[PDB]
């Protein structure tokens, strides 16, 4: 369960502050 | 002596070393320091089980696990789980002793050492308030804050109502002032001044008083950005002087009270709110307890003049000439000066450690730049090539990690590549070569690559004092495009989406359009690119302005051929989603009309979510408070029970798997649900 294929690894088309806990 | 009234001293006290040492050891009232110590200890006691992760220790440091960790020094490793529980217990006992004032120095050290060990164990949890907590503990270790309102003075009369040297207050005031002033000079960035950092925050319901006289854009530009910058730049000066102390106190109280509700920053706001009555006179608790009704004045300790103390030097015109300052006084003055200078210098030391400089300077956590930069991630792809067979495989982004901060830094990426290199052979993979492909946008800019995708990270070169070469530069001469980008995004449909991409010459992007992503097109905004359809094998060159429609369920490539970076955009529609929505709406309307004269199940569960949200809105706040209290109680109880189990294991020994399973089951009962 640690390997993608090449039709889920290439799908480009499918907010983060570091102070928050 | 107007200067002697504004500053509390005269210009002649700084003309000699002996005079400066005599001034910095002037006797002072210890009441404010004791109150601050009590509040800080209480807040650390409350914070240890929640943010430091005492309740998730068994999940984080589970025995026999494959995890990539990110320590500051690779020679630092965590202990087994039982010893981690013991470390956290010692930290808790130290914080409790600090709060109570009992065995002040020992408790201070017992909190200071494990806290910093845990801080240095992981770089991915560093923030500004954790760094501040470490600094405050380090300062309070050398201070004598147990001279008032404490158990130590209750059981020992030599340290009860004694004086303190002046530099105890000077160090703390200097620390607070440094934090405030260096947070405001960091927010004199073009992103903050122009209003690009916190653009959606004005939509909150707390800002509705301000909308009675301003537009939403003006509210965002003035109240959120300029107001915050001005408060940061002027708070120290407002608090220091006695003419404007009251107005400054009110302003900072409002600022911190609003920030505690807008964000999730643990105990930062409460720590800051209780560090502001330390710019007042050191005798304020005495006056406050004097102003209370005389009925409640006979149970507190009797008020009397503080007794003399050894630590502070005494200079009187009549009471002898004075004593020679010993080693303690000079050491205190030197500590004050050196610590304040180092705390001034450290946020601006990024030109020495160049190996930690990505798009943003340094690591995150010690430069007082909060909420200035926001990051959005579009795609992450990790591919390894086997060194024995040559086959190419793909991994999930973040397989053996527990955070996502490795995507923004090169040292963390090097650590991750090394850990993967050592872990993959366990999964029948020979020595691999690992390549990373990550797309990031900062502050609503174009998406672009942060690292080179053609470089094998495991064998790459990284040094703490040398600028990294496989880090791509940020395309700074594309920011004025943000107005056009926002206009294009706004002038769209409720079912379409857009993605803005900027690419470097000599590189290509390979994309696979999903089956459900019908009606997908690409349009070029600058430069020149050529699009190749993999199946039909047909290159096609695009010019500035035109658009091309792409097939679905197929691969395609975009090659950048211009000598300068080129930007384009993706427009796509979820045809399956729109068809589902339209058929759901049609069927719901038909059913309603028929009655009154899994698709429906999804509609009904979304309706149930809406009903729950609106009913919790209608429910009074007392139920929310009760639920909040129940959750907090559950967290505290679980932390205590797991700590007890681990201590029993350490002291006696592991009894049996059945009893251990029974105890673990007992510790997760959710007391009152
Ligand atoms: C002039 C040296 C700095 C003193 C502060 C001048 C005020 C002008 C603007 C500064 C805003 C706040 C500065 C930080 C506050 C910490 C210092 C402090 O509290 O000093 C006040 C205090 C008197 O307090 P009270 O009698 O309660 O008077 C209160 C007024 N109603 O006086 C002192 O402790 C004198 C301290 C002398 C300076 C030592 C502290 C600052 C050290 C500078 C850090 C840099 C290190 C070496 C500097 C290199 C270049 C010079
Ligand atoms: C043997 C003893 C047994 C005791 C058992 C008692 C039974 C009752 C059990 C009580 C259970 C509650 C324990 C936890 C305390 C209350 C809950 C709590 O603090 O929650 C945190 C809550 C918010 O947390 P969030 O981050 O929203 O949490 C959600 C996480 N996303 O934080 C707070 O409310 C902070 C509370 C501390 C306030 C105390 C005062 C703080 C400082 C203000 C003082 C101002 C300055 C005064 C001037 C003096 C200056 C020198
Ligand atoms: C020292 C504790 C400070 C606590 C941090 C709080 C804020 C302090 C600000 C400093 C932030 C960053 C500066 C740290 C510099 C030291 C880091 C260091 O040497 O180790 C890095 C590196 C490990 O790299 P990773 O990416 O984990 O490994 C990659 C492959 N897995 O270690 C090494 O390369 C071995 C040691 C390198 C040389 C050691 C330093 C020699 C010169 C000493 C002067 C520099 C540090 C002085 C410290 C000043 C006080 C803060
Ligand atoms: C009848 C049977 C089921 C007994 C089960 C009782 C538990 C629900 C008790 C036992 C231990 C108790 C805990 C023991 C110690 C503390 C520390 C105490 O620490 C404080 O933070 C108080 C001091 C402060 O406010 O700083 C908070 C309550 C708590 C978690 C207690 C919550 C309730 C616990 C888990
Ligand atoms: C594919 O999507 C595009 C983009 O939404 C559609 O183009 C829109 O067409 C409507 C007319 O129905 C215009 O009012 C919009 O201005 C157009 N938008 C853009 C960005 O040009 C197009 O109609 C869709 N095609 C199909 C077959 O669904
Ligand atoms: C489509 O155009 C590219 C040039 O943009 C052609 O050449 C490739 O260019 C990229 C980037 O410059 C290189 O990485 C490739 O090695 C080049 N060769 C190939 C075969 O991709 C490309 O050949 C063109 N496609 C066709 C079918 O002619
Ligand atoms: C048992 C050990 C590993 C626990 C950690 C103890 C040592 C390493 C800790 C305890 C006190 C800490 C210091 C406390 C204060 C500061 C000032 C700050 O501006 C830089 C870091 C620095 C200099 C810390 C470095 C780490 C430190 C020296
Ligand atoms: C959204 O707008 C802001 C968000 C965070 C802050 C920071 C800040 O600048 C600061 C300085 C000292 C103490 C606390 C803080 C904050 O909370 C300020 C404005
Ligand atoms: C939206 O598109 C994604 C792929 O782009 C697809 O996986 C998803 O199923 C679509 N939404 C719905 C509701 O089908």
Describe what you observe in this structure.
The complex is a heterodimer of chains A (21) and B (673). By secondary structure, chain A is low in regular secondary structure. In chain A, 0% of the residues lie in helices and 0% in strands. Chain A is elongated, with a radius of gyration of 14 Å. With 673 residues, chain B is an alpha+beta fold. In chain B, α5 (81-100) packs across α20. In chain B, the strands form three sheets. A four-stranded antiparallel sheet of chain B has the order 2-1-3-4, with no helix packed on it. Chain B has helices at 2-6, 17-24, 31-47, 57-60, 81-100, 104-121, 128-142, 151-155, 167-184, 190-193, 216-240, 245-262, 268-273, 284-291, 327-345, 410-423, 482-490, 575-595, 599-618, 621-651, 657-666; strands at residues 375-386, 392-395, 432-442, 448-449, 496-503, 508-512, 520-524, 529-533, 538-542, 547-550, 555-560, 566-573. Chain B has five domains: 13-29 and 165-290 and 320-346, no CATH class; 30-162, no CATH class; 374-474, no CATH class; 481-576, Sandwich (Jelly Rolls), CATH 2.60.120.10; 599-673, no CATH class. In chain B, 44% of the residues lie in helices and 11% in strands. In chain B, a hairpin with a 5-residue loop joins β1 and β2. Chain A binds chain B through residues 2-7, 9-21, and chain B through 51, 127-129, 263-266, 364, 370-371, 374-379, 381, 383, 393-396, 399, 405, 427, 439, 497, 499, 509-514, 517, 520, 555, 570, 572. Chain A: Residues 2-14 form a propeptide. Chain A: It is found in: Secreted. Chain A: Anticoagulant plasma protein; it is a cofactor to activated protein C in the degradation of coagulation factors Va and VIIIa. It helps to prevent coagulation and stimulating fibrinolysis. Chain A: This is Vitamin K-dependent protein S.
Question: What descriptors fit this protein?
Answer:
heterodimer, A: 21 residues, little secondary structure, 0% helix, B: 673 residues, 5 domains, four-stranded antiparallel β-sheet, binds a molecule of 2 linked components (NAG-NAG), binds cholesterol, Vitamin K-dependent protein S (chain A), Vitamin K-dependent gamma-carboxylase (chain B), transmembrane helix (chain B)
